[PDB]
């Protein structure tokens, strides 16, 4: 219930914390396709997502259950895996941050 959303908010705070900043920083804000020269990004990624958007939704009480929060976080990683070849640093960073997310999300209070 609200208890499960508190667990989600805790995960979100952890993903944004200094402990994980070395691999989380590419996901703090929406991909700036123009600034990075990725002029095909929005043709390949039709539903962009990032941690600032997840945080805005959490602060506005947008998520009604844990599954909705998890779908957004996982969409963010999915976009990274779709756009970027797996040998690029951003994919290694995404996989490590998703490890953090999945292992803690799995500890959802029942």
């Amino acid at each position: 219930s609200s208890e499960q959303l508190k667990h989600c908010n805790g995960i979100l705070k952890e993903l944004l914390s200094k402990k994980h900043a070395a691999y989380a920083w590419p996901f703090y804000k929406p991909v700036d396709a123009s600034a990075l020269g990725l002029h095909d990004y929005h043709d390949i990624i039709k539903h962009p997502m990032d941690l600032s958007t997840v945080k805005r939704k959490m602060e506005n009480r947008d998520y009604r259950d844990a599954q909705e929060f998890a779908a957004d976080v996982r969409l963010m990683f999915s976009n990274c895996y779709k756009y970027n070849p797996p040998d690029h640093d951003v994919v290694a960073m995404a996989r490590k941050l998703q490890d953090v997310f999945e292992f803690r999300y799995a500890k959802m209070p029942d």
Binding site: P26, L38, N84, H88, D89, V90
Partner: peptide
């Protein structure tokens, strides 16, 4: 930051 966007991190 990126040395090369997406490809290689610098920080």
């Amino acid at each position: 930051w990126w040395i090369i966007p997406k490809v290689k991190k610098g920080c």
